[PDB]
Design an enzyme around this catalytic site. Structure first.
Site, short mmCIF file in Angstrom:
data_model
loop_
_atom_site.label_atom_id
_atom_site.label_comp_id
_atom_site.label_asym_id
_atom_site.label_seq_id
_atom_site.Cartn_x
_atom_site.Cartn_y
_atom_site.Cartn_z
N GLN A 1 0.82 -1.20 0.00
CA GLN A 1 0.00 0.00 0.00
C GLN A 1 0.86 1.26 0.00
O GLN A 1 0.59 2.21 -0.75
CB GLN A 1 -0.93 -0.01 1.21
CG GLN A 1 -1.31 1.37 1.69
CD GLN A 1 -2.33 1.34 2.79
OE1 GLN A 1 -3.49 0.99 2.57
NE2 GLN A 1 -1.90 1.68 4.00
N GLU B 1 -3.68 -7.10 -1.83
CA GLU B 1 -5.08 -6.85 -1.53
C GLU B 1 -5.65 -5.86 -2.53
O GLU B 1 -4.93 -4.98 -3.01
CB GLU B 1 -5.24 -6.33 -0.09
CG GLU B 1 -4.55 -5.02 0.23
CD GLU B 1 -5.39 -3.81 -0.12
OE1 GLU B 1 -6.62 -3.98 -0.26
OE2 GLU B 1 -4.83 -2.71 -0.26
N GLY C 1 3.48 -6.42 5.67
CA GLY C 1 3.61 -7.80 5.26
C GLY C 1 3.84 -7.97 3.78
O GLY C 1 4.76 -8.67 3.37
N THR C 2 2.99 -7.33 2.97
CA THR C 2 3.17 -7.42 1.52
C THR C 2 4.50 -6.83 1.10
O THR C 2 5.33 -7.51 0.48
CB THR C 2 2.02 -6.71 0.80
OG1 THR C 2 0.79 -7.40 1.06
CG2 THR C 2 2.27 -6.68 -0.70
N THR D 1 2.94 1.97 13.01
CA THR D 1 1.55 1.58 12.89
C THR D 1 1.37 0.06 12.93
O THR D 1 0.40 -0.46 12.37
CB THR D 1 0.94 2.14 11.60
OG1 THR D 1 1.63 1.59 10.47
CG2 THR D 1 1.07 3.65 11.57
N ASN E 1 9.19 7.87 8.48
CA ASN E 1 8.01 8.72 8.43
C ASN E 1 8.09 9.94 9.34
O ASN E 1 7.61 11.02 8.96
CB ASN E 1 6.76 7.91 8.77
CG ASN E 1 6.23 7.14 7.58
OD1 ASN E 1 6.55 7.44 6.43
ND2 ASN E 1 5.42 6.12 7.86
N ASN F 1 4.12 11.54 0.69
CA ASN F 1 4.34 10.95 -0.63
C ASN F 1 4.71 12.01 -1.65
O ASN F 1 5.48 11.72 -2.58
CB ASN F 1 3.09 10.19 -1.07
CG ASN F 1 2.78 9.01 -0.17
OD1 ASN F 1 3.65 8.51 0.53
ND2 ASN F 1 1.53 8.56 -0.20
N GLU G 1 26.02 5.76 -12.91
CA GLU G 1 27.02 6.82 -12.79
C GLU G 1 27.27 7.19 -11.34
O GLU G 1 28.42 7.32 -10.91
CB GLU G 1 26.58 8.04 -13.60
CG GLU G 1 27.53 9.23 -13.63
CD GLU G 1 28.79 8.97 -14.42
OE1 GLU G 1 28.78 8.08 -15.29
OE2 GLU G 1 29.78 9.70 -14.21
N1 LIG Z 1 5.72 7.40 3.69
C1 LIG Z 1 4.60 6.68 3.62
N2 LIG Z 1 4.44 5.58 4.45
C2 LIG Z 1 3.31 4.84 4.38
C3 LIG Z 1 2.30 5.17 3.49
N3 LIG Z 1 1.31 4.27 3.64
C4 LIG Z 1 1.66 3.38 4.60
N4 LIG Z 1 2.91 3.72 5.07
C5 LIG Z 1 3.68 3.03 6.11
O1 LIG Z 1 4.15 1.79 5.64
C6 LIG Z 1 4.06 0.82 6.66
C7 LIG Z 1 3.88 -0.58 6.09
O2 LIG Z 1 2.84 -0.63 5.13
P1 LIG Z 1 1.44 -1.35 5.47
O3 LIG Z 1 0.53 -0.44 6.24
O4 LIG Z 1 1.67 -2.63 6.23
O5 LIG Z 1 0.81 -1.67 4.03
P2 LIG Z 1 1.55 -2.68 3.01
O6 LIG Z 1 2.96 -2.20 2.76
O7 LIG Z 1 0.77 -2.79 1.73
O8 LIG Z 1 1.59 -4.10 3.77
P3 LIG Z 1 0.23 -4.89 4.11
O9 LIG Z 1 -0.42 -4.28 5.33
O10 LIG Z 1 0.54 -6.34 4.37
O11 LIG Z 1 -0.70 -4.76 2.93
C8 LIG Z 1 2.90 1.25 7.54
O12 LIG Z 1 3.19 0.98 8.89
C9 LIG Z 1 2.79 2.75 7.32
O13 LIG Z 1 3.27 3.44 8.44
C10 LIG Z 1 2.46 6.27 2.66
O14 LIG Z 1 1.57 6.58 1.87
N5 LIG Z 1 3.61 7.02 2.73
N1 LIG Z 2 36.70 22.88 -18.12
C1 LIG Z 2 35.65 22.02 -18.20
N2 LIG Z 2 35.59 20.98 -17.35
C2 LIG Z 2 34.57 20.10 -17.39
C3 LIG Z 2 33.51 20.29 -18.39
N3 LIG Z 2 32.63 19.29 -18.22
C4 LIG Z 2 33.09 18.52 -17.20
N4 LIG Z 2 34.24 19.00 -16.71
C5 LIG Z 2 35.03 18.42 -15.60
O1 LIG Z 2 35.05 17.00 -15.70
C6 LIG Z 2 34.86 16.39 -14.42
C7 LIG Z 2 33.88 15.25 -14.58
O2 LIG Z 2 34.24 14.53 -15.76
P1 LIG Z 2 33.20 13.57 -16.50
O3 LIG Z 2 32.11 14.37 -17.17
O4 LIG Z 2 32.62 12.56 -15.54
O5 LIG Z 2 34.13 12.86 -17.60
P2 LIG Z 2 33.56 11.64 -18.49
O6 LIG Z 2 32.94 10.60 -17.60
O7 LIG Z 2 34.71 11.04 -19.25
O8 LIG Z 2 32.53 12.16 -19.46
C8 LIG Z 2 34.32 17.46 -13.49
O9 LIG Z 2 35.13 17.54 -12.32
C9 LIG Z 2 34.39 18.76 -14.26
O10 LIG Z 2 35.20 19.71 -13.56
C10 LIG Z 2 33.64 21.46 -19.29
O11 LIG Z 2 32.79 21.70 -20.17
N5 LIG Z 2 34.71 22.25 -19.14
MG LIG Z 3 -2.29 -3.42 3.15
#
Ligand SMILES: Nc1nc2c(ncn2[C@@H]2O[C@H](COP(=O)(O)OP(=O)(O)OP(=O)(O)O)[C@@H](O)[C@H]2O)c(=O)[nH]1
Ligand SMILES: Nc1nc2c(ncn2[C@@H]2O[C@H](COP(=O)(O)OP(=O)(O)O)[C@@H](O)[C@H]2O)c(=O)[nH]1
Ligand SMILES: [Mg+2]
Ligand SMILES: Nc1nc2c(ncn2[C@@H]2O[C@H](COP(=O)(O)OP(=O)(O)O)[C@@H](O)[C@H]2O)c(=O)[nH]1
Lengths: 262, 429, 439, 107, 48, 49, 429
Positions: free
Chosen positions: C11, C71, C144-145, C179, C206, C228, C254
């Site tokens: 859920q 469910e 559980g799920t 919960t 949470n 969410n 990356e």
């Molecule tokens: N951040 C976030 N947490 C949630 C949300 N909904 C439920 N939770 C949390 O997730 C925990 C576990 O989920 P469940 O309530 O057991 O629901 P489920 O994951 O589908 O598991 P089942 O009850 O077996 O169906 C709960 O204790 C809630 O606290 C949500 O929308 N956002």
């Molecule tokens: N001078 C300059 N440096 C760059 C540029 N683009 C990326 N860099 C440098 O390159 C580093 C990252 O390299 P990266 O993009 O991962 O190299 P690649 O994986 O081979 O494509 C960073 O620390 C930047 O400082 C650019 O247009 N000019």
């Molecule tokens: Mg449920």
């Protein structure tokens, strides 16, 4: 503003930025191009017998997209074959210089066709090859509508169902011939010397490819708005052995100064 | 020097239709037969493929033949449905069923009479026949069996004339038939005996070309047919147009066939560029030669490094000096002497036509009698033995009156030709 | 290319998926009908949606998600909800009977009859993707799920798709708010799966989100909806690098190698800033240094685990908006000079910087305000041993004389599984302590 | 009569969809001359003159003094190869029948 | 000496066989001038 | 091709981005100048009245 | 004559494509590839960095190389990005993942075959190339790993040809990668054994110049790469243009490489000034020389004051008198003899190029083989050994395929060259 930090240096940077720049020019060029293309043109009316005439401006209208054949002068390509200017179908209200075309006769007839009469010299006849030229005002060189064979690198601008039709100055050529025919392929066997009426719905063929002009109503956004793709190829609802039955509205056209398709 | 062509099967019908597409494009012939060229060069030798009528209409010297009637019922709806003669359409009530036996012995026999009638029409209509061309696929029944029957009758009637054969060699990577090895084996030895020299295509090689050279996603068979048609048009370029070094089919056969049995060639076109790379590449003779000897441009699924070139022919087209086109291939021979054969000095033969294809400044068609041609025949023979050991799909062939021993004879011919190619590849001076 | 498959288990996973998917649709301009308006101003279409949406010949965009839940209530309500046309009618799997907060039930009795269909849907998702980057599994192990079926699904993914990247956004039990009474049992049983078949696990407790939204947004009673929304904001900030071009673009693999120093060490905290209300959004100058300081502040964290009790091993900072590679560098340098946070000795650099030119979007009716720039954290630090030390202490307290264990035994789970998970969590304590120990 | 999913995850209008996504920031890059230029940026001059060309010339026809050779704003007047190249590669634009010319060359 | 240019000027518009040029003309503008009124199917210059 | 299509999309989006930033700077400058002129004329009118 | 360039990684690709804009500006080439230079000085040597196509378009001899399709899309992000040949765009489906091992051994190695194919084709296209150029960053994985992998086969295939590499060495102050010490250590030894000369670029010093030498308020990477583009244009300005005192790649190498292991150069540009004070700086050779040798102007983040110049090179550009272009070098040597090693008298290779970049009166590029390269190598090697002692992040590399002790070998190749620079820092006659 506030003089904290390198205010003087930022001011000099900005000032020299505008100095080097010296957007607006591009917008002005765009507006000038729109005005040049949409400069209205006077197309000749239907006179005496309702037969289509040569050497007169006209509007070519499709029966499916209800649009008119148009060409956008920019957005070209320089291929070894020559210049490639993209053409499409656009919904137009008046006979602008962009979307108007003139028919001129071609060199070689069917070699089976009859000698056209002296009085009907200026009248286009069924199956008589003709070039489609842009009017004078669009550009000081003549642009000719022509298609080409479907190859690996040749197709419609977005889709690939039809061939690539385009406007190019390479006129007086085999590719640039276009012939005219009635709406019925069955009836396009006996009316070949008869003049073509203007008011009737009609159809365009490309001589080299033996394919009819059509538009799929597939929208691609060109610099003038949303154009309809234009190409060549026989389109049928059923992909039968020979096709050629009831022609799809893609391939139907019309060349009337007065009146529009639906 | 007229060359009269025939198209067998639906594969042959499509390939010949687009071959005539290319030929009419080159010669300025409208789908209705009117000549609409620009210069007299096109009209000078337009008679090799077309004959004029009383009204000046040009008609191709083509014979369309297939047991399945739908292929020629549909080709009439193509761009050149009205170009060919109405009486050159020779159809049967039913197709060969991909069966070589009934395409060559039962259904072909009752229709090969009319096919020979029309072929003799076209042959006797010309002042000097130069070759009988035939485009077909060896993996089918009507294209392979009935086409080979036509080749046999044509060889019997005209022993001293060129027998152009454009055979589409099927490959298992693109296999769409199961009697593929059977038909290929039953047609290849007939090709060996009754054809002076063959010209063989692979669908998979063409697919690889359109994948990694043209960089194109998903067109129909039209792309493969266009490439093969370009090769077909370019092989007779020197015949159809003047040039600095003219050549004909007999000269090509003389320069490419050292021994009568060894007459299978792999083809390559140049230049080929992607949709958006024509103007990014400089068309030069060196680039053309590199593409000719590059594997990815080979229209045959054989690796040239595994074999050695018995001979090669380069039908170049376009205005250019001769030294940079012949010394270039001498240089490629010098650098790839291992890929060539010692006891034939300068396996390369060059021909120059002076009219390049429209839209190209210069081009070239490559032909090669490489010993690597044996790879496809090895594969076909292995598949044939695998199928034949269990007598699979053999009742269809034996019910058409064709003898059991003919399959073993075809196997023996395959082994003999493979042995010849191998023993000329590994031969030492 | 760069396609990522979203999986939502339980859920909590399903609701987090709903939030992140409305956020993705808002970012990519997709209406609930599944269509995208034609960008007539430019004239050619974006491909950024490809990572989360698949195009149809009719022009409709189908999300690359699988809602797996034992469910039917939540999935049926989604089917009745606004995004019914958007979501695929399949890949929205509904069970018939809930796992009832039982890891044994979700992994041994009800898990098998639905894991085959779940893997079939996963395969239908993957074979569509020709450039599949990896899987992002949103779940809460407390239930559980999400514990049992999640563990089984991770087993099958690990054994069938090789070394494909996996990002487990897991909602662990909080120090005080919970919960369920069997929630620590489910958590400790699922730690084995989240340690063996999870490439990078992200902490989503949470209470941290609750108090962060309470004190930062000045909203008295936000709910699961708002938490969410924050989770979706964090995941969107993490994944926007491959969707929108930036000065420094980092893909999943990356930053995975930069995040994970050792295979057993992949549990990471997260934070996001500025998480600011509209009233005070336009009064403060939210500079790059300011938002970086807010992120590094122990209070301003999406996970309730004080970093000062541990040492940072690898921090990854995902900036979105008008940030500049030198403002991020200046903030990094000033904070290295600052000493209230400790970095482990064997990781001198210890910093990764990804930059994107796409400022975060705002969900209409939400609480996040329109801000020109923001930054998210993926921080691997030794402080995470604290939450495990709480959860295993709770598990030992309830397991001293086997509270709520007959339920697990009757579902086909041996008594030794609890003990096994116990020394697994003990080893996950020991390895973290060892890597945190000075050389 | 309503659920939390309905209350929070409401339907969205086209304007709301458009306004939810903000236009992305655009990185600002200084122009090449702006980063590396000296003097008046409004009138950028060129110094494409050859020292050998300036110093060695037909002295009777024309003479350049020493300081003029050392510094002078201009571009060299030797342009025969460039003129040939432009001639080879020859307000509505002009589209000459280069395709027909090429076809005539081919035939 | 521009060989290609003078070729375009003269050879491209030259006619070698006027019989063929009349019989099967393409996109040729030269040599089309034939006998003026000599060939009428009626066989007589008189009106039909 | 996909690569060229995506690259061309990048072309046009970056060009649009640049134009938007440019006339945003122009509108900021124009608003500043308009405010200046408006208050100068307002002060003149106040003194005259 | 010509120099063919290769770009690796995001940093290297962006830097190289931003440099191609400078080159096209210098040679008068629009993005469409057509030539618009007003004199033959920009055309007589355009073949150094360009090759002509059939239509006259000048395609750069640039081999773009990476593992990110997005990086291939955004490398051509500049206005002149369309100029590149599409076929040279080569990339892998999955990126390097910031992994030297992944870029070098398994996923980048399967594409190095195509890299070598296109590079060899381009090299054979010209008459005979004078050397190779590379642009990459050791901080990343694909730029460093596969770049070194490429220069390996480049050196193997062309042993006697120049191998220039512009390598960006990130600093801990500007570092944004944790496996950066690993990548740098694994790539430095390849640069040592693979490149005849390789200057180092540090984003720390680049930023320092952009902050308090250009006095800019907001320069991004695009403006950051400008210094690198200018200096790597001035390195071959003498190749592409005439001059009173010509130079080329080997000209510089023979004068800046006293010993084979000593080819790591710190280097910079001049003149530099704030946009608030151009009209107050009097452009002269004395001012140029004054701004060459100060620590701030040079684009390497280790001051020359703690080291002794093994040798230095001054590639001036623009019509300037030969007396003061070199007596300034004499004067700086004589007033800072403590900063130059005594056993190499007249440490300065002075060269003059005829045509400066357009819009610039005069310029100069400074390339010095000073001994404080040991500073960057120490500040990266200490991080490498600290992070390697505790086995940190090594599991990715080991699983990817590299041996555990290959890193020990890389650290040894760090330390031996560091000691090599030390033992000449304080050398006595
Ligand atoms: N951040 C976030 N947490 C949630 C949300 N909904 C439920 N939770 C949390 O997730 C925990 C576990 O989920 P469940 O309530 O057991 O629901 P489920 O994951 O589908 O598991 P089942 O009850 O077996 O169906 C709960 O204790 C809630 O606290 C949500 O929308 N956002
Ligand atoms: N001078 C300059 N440096 C760059 C540029 N683009 C990326 N860099 C440098 O390159 C580093 C990252 O390299 P990266 O993009 O991962 O190299 P690649 O994986 O081979 O494509 C960073 O620390 C930047 O400082 C650019 O247009 N000019
Ligand atoms: Mg449920
Ligand atoms: N290039 C090309 N190959 C074709 C075409 N049609 C069929 N083929 C090939 O021919 C093989 C089947 O042979 P088939 O046409 O049935 O032989 P037939 O019945 O005797 O004419 C298949 O492997 C196809 O790859 C076509 O239009 N073009």
């Amino acid at each position: 503003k506030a003089l904290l930090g390198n205010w003087f240096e930022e001011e000099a940077y900005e000032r020299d930025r505008q100095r080097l720049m010296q957007a607006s020019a591009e917008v002005a060029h765009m507006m000038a191009k729109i005005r040049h293309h949409n400069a209205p043109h006077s197309i000749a009316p239907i006179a005496e017998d309702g037969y289509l005439r040569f050497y007169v401006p006209l509007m070519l209208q499709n029966a499916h997209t209800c649009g008119f054949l148009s060409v956008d002068l920019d957005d070209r390509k320089a291929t070894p074959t020559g210049w490639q200017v993209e053409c499409s179908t656009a919904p137009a209200e008046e006979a602008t210089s962009r979307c108007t075309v003139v028919l001129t006769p071609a060199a070689m007839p069917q070699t089976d066709s009859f000698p056209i009469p002296e009085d009907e010299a200026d009248i286009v006849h069924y199956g008589q090859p003709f070039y489609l030229m842009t009017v004078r005002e669009l550009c000081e060189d003549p642009l000719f509508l022509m298609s080409e064979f479907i190859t690996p690198g040749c197709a419609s601008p977005v889709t690939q169902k039809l061939q690539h039709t385009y406007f190019s100055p390479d006129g007086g050529s085999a590719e640039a011939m276009w012939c005219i025919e009635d709406a019925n392929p069955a009836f396009q066997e006996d009316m070949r010397d008869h003049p073509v009426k203007a008011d009737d719905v009609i159809r365009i063929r490309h001589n080299m490819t033996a394919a009819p002009l059509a538009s799929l109503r597939e929208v691609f956004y060109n610099d003038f708005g949303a154009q309809f793709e234009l190409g060549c190829g026989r389109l049928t609802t059923l992909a039968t052995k020979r096709r050629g039955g009831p022609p799809a509205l893609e391939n139907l056209w019309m060349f009337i100064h007065d009146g529009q398709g639906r | 020097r007229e060359i009269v062509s025939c198209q067998a099967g639906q594969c042959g019908n499509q390939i010949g239709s687009k071959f005539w597409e290319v030929i009419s494009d080159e010669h300025g012939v409208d789908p209705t037969g009117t000549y609409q060229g620009d210069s007299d060069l096109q009209l000078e030798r337009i008679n090799v493929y077309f004959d004029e009528s009383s009204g000046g209409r040009y008609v191709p010297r083509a014979v369309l033949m297939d047991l399945e009637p739908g292929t020629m019922d549909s080709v009439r709806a193509g761009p050149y449905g009205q170009l060919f003669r109405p009486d050159n359409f020779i159809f049967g009530q039913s197709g060969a069923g991909n069966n070589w036996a009934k395409g060559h012995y039962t259904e072909g026999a009752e229709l090969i009479d009319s096919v020979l009638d029309v072929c003799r029409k076209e042959a006797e209509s010309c002042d000097c026949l130069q070759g009988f061309q035939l485009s077909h696929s060896l993996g089918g029944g009507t294209g392979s069996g009935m086409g080979t029957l036509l080749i046999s009758k044509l060889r019997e009637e005209y022993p001293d004339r060129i027998m152009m054969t454009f055979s589409v060699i099927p490959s298992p990577r693109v296999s769409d038939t199961v009697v593929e090895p059977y038909n290929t084996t039953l047609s290849v030895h007939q090709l060996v005996e009754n054809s002076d020299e063959s010209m063989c295509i692979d669908n998979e090689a063409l697919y690889d070309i359109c994948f990694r050279t043209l960089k194109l996603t998903t067109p129909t068979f039209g792309d493969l047919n266009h490439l093969v048609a370009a090769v077909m048009s370019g092989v007779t370029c020197c015949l159809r147009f003047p040039g600095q070094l003219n050549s004909d089919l007999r000269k090509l056969a003389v320069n490419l066939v050292p021994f009568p049995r060894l007459h299978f060639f792999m083809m390559g076109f140049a230049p080929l560029t992607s949709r958006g790379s024509q103007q990014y590449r400089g068309l030069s003779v060196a680039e053309l030669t590199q593409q000719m000897f590059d594997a990815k441009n080979m229209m045959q699924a054989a690796d040239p490094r595994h074999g050695r070139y018995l001979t090669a022919s380069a039908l170049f087209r376009g205005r250019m000096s001769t030294k940079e086109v012949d010394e270039q291939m001498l240089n490629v021979q010098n650098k790839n002497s291992s890929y060539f054969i010692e006891w034939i000095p300068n396996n390369i033969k060059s021909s120059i036509c002076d009219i390049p294809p429209k839209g190209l400044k210069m081009s070239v068609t490559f032909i090669g009698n490489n010993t690597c041609i044996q790879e496809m025949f090895r594969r076909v023979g292995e598949q044939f033995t695998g199928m034949f050991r269990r007598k699979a799909f053999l009742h269809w062939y034996t019910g058409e009156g064709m003898d059991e021993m003919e399959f073993t004879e075809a196997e023996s011919n395959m082994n003999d030709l493979v042995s010849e190619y191998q023993q000329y590849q590994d031969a030492t001076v | 290319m760069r396609e990522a498959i979203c999986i939502h288990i339980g859920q909590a996973g399903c609701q987090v998926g709903n939030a992140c998917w409305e956020l993705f649709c808002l970012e990519h301009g997709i209406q609930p009908d599944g269509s995208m308006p034609s960008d007539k101003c430019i004239g050619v279409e974006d491909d950024a949606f490809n990572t989360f949406f698949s195009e149809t010949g009719a022009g409709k965009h189908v999300p690359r998600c699988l809602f797996l839940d034992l469910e039917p209530t939540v999935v049926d309500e989604v089917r009745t909800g606004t995004y019914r046309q958007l979501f695929n009618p399949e890949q929205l799997v509904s069970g018939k009977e809930d796992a009832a907060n039982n890891y044994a039930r979700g992994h041994y009795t009800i898990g098998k009859e639905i894991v085959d269909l779940a893997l079939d849907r996963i395969r239908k998702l993957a074979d569509n993707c020709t450039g599949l980057q990896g899987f992002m599994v949103f779940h809460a192990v407390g239930g559980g799920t999400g514990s049992g079926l999640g563990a089984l699904l991770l087993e099958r993914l690990s054994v069938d798709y090789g070394k494909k990247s996996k990002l487990g956004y897991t909602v662990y039990p909080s120090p005080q708010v919970s919960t369920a009474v069997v929630e620590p049992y489910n958590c400790v049983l699922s730690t084995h799966s989240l340690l063996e078949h999870t490439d990078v696990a992200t902490m989503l407790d949470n209470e941290a989100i609750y108090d962060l939204t309470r004190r930062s947004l000045d909203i008295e009673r936000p709910s699961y909806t708002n938490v969410n929304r924050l989770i979706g904001q964090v995941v969107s900030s993490l994944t926007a690098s491959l969707r929108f071009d930036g000065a420094l673009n980092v893909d999943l693999t990356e930053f995975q190698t930069n995040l994970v120093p050792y295979p057993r060490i992949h549990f990471v905290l997260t934070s996001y800033a500025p998480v600011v209300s509209a009233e005070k959004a336009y009064h403060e100058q939210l500079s790059v240094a300011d938002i970086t300081n807010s992120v590094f502040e122990p209070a301003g964290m999406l996970t309730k685990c004080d970093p000062r009790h541990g040492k940072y091993m690898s921090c990854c900072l995902m900036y979105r908006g008008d940030v500049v590679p030198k403002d991020v560098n200046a903030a990094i340098a000033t904070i290295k000079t600052k000493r209230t946070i400790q970095f482990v000795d064997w990781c001198p650099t210890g910093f990764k910087c990804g930059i994107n030119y796409q400022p975060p979007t705002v969900v209409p009716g939400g609480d996040l305000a329109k801000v020109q720039r923001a930054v998210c954290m993926i921080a691997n630090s030794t402080a995470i041993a604290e939450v495990f030390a709480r959860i295993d202490h709770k598990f030992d307290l309830m397991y001293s004389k086997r509270a709520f264990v007959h339920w697990y035994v009757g579902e086909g789970m041996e008594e030794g599984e609890f003990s096994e998970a116990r020394e697994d969590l003990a080893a996950l304590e020991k390895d973290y302590e060892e890597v945190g120990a000075e050389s | 009569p309503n659920t939390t999913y309905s209350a929070s995850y409401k339907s969205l209008t086209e304007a709301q969809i458009a306004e939810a996504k903000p236009p992305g920031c655009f990185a600002a890059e200084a122009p090449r001359m702006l980063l590396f230029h000296h003097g008046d940026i409004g009138n950028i001059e060129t110094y494409c003159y050859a020292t050998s060309e300036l110093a060695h010339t037909d002295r009777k026809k024309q003479v350049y003094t020493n300081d003029e050779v050392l510094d002078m704003p201009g571009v060299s007047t030797r342009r025969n190869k460039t003129a040939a190249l432009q001639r080879s590669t020859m307000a509505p634009p002009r589209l000459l029948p280069m395709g027909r010319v090429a076809e005539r060359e081919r035939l | 000496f521009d060989g290609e240019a003078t070729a375009l000027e003269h050879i491209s518009f030259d006619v070698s066989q006027p019989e063929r040029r009349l019989w099967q003309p393409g996109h040729a503008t030269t040599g089309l001038e034939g006998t003026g009124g000599g060939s009428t199917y009626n066989g007589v210059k008189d009106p039909w | 091709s996909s690569s060229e299509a995506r690259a061309e999309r990048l072309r046009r989006v970056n060009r649009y981005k640049a134009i938007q930033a440019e006339l945003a700077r122009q509108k900021e400058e124009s608003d500043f100048a308009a405010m200046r002129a408006a208050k100068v004329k307002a002060a003149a009118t106040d003194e005259a009245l």
